[PDB]
Symmetry: C2
């Protein structure tokens, strides 16, 4: 039974693979079927951030699996007006809502109350099944 351990920075062979949510990419240690086929456990230190593209490796180095942010039910906000988005970011952080931030776009786990709070800013909120990479801050 192969078990993942250390996390390298160097993006080696993408021959192996695994796809997990944000929920599990902060467990440091767990197990479920993978993408390369070969099931495997986990051995990562405390308080680690696993990002889409972040390669992993074992003690032997024979394998270099890759972590992939699985699609997750999220609310997506797209606007080309930084101000309207800035305001939003403020109020979401004020409720400690894990949020993904990119130019012209925001992502947070689907929640209608939040969608209505954002629509109250004249923002368009649409549902999506996409990878969720919220801001570093657990």
């Amino acid at each position: 039974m192969l078990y993942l351990t250390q996390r390298l920075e160097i993006p080696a062979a993408a021959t192996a693979s695994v796809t997990l949510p944000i929920d599990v990419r902060v467990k440091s240690r767990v197990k479920v079927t993978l993408n390369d086929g070969r099931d495997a456990g986990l051995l990562l230190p405390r308080g680690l951030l696993l990002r889409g593209g972040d390669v992993l490796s074992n003690e032997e180095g024979t394998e270099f699996v890759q972590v992939i942010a699985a699609d997750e039910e999220v609310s997506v906000v797209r606007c080309d007006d930084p101000f309207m988005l800035a305001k939003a970011c403020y109020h979401l952080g004020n409720r400690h809502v894990p949020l993904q931030i990119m130019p012209g776009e925001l992502r947070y786990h689907a929640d209608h109350v939040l969608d209505d709070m954002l629509r109250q800013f004249g923002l368009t909120v649409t549902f999506g099944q996409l990878p969720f990479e919220p801001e570093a801050g657990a």
Copy 2:
């Protein structure tokens, strides 16, 4: 004494004014000093936010006091890259920091800890003595 009890939606020619910082402007019941030296007691409806430009009057409609946001010690954050400002807003709100948000310009009570924290994000912080008007949520 003199009591200001209403905030007329309808403007009017001001007969006086009182300068006040945000902490006071959130206070419904309080004794203040008009800029002409007279003492007036604010007795407006509870839970109301006084903004600069607000005009308070009395029952008899014989006094129209204009609220002026007092100059406060604030840090000012800018960046030609608007996307950089957003992340700062998210973190500031995470810490529940009163914040004034304008297009390409943030403002908050000067605090050196927050300043460094924002420089990390690579934001240039500046200082000013300006009227502070934080978001109300």
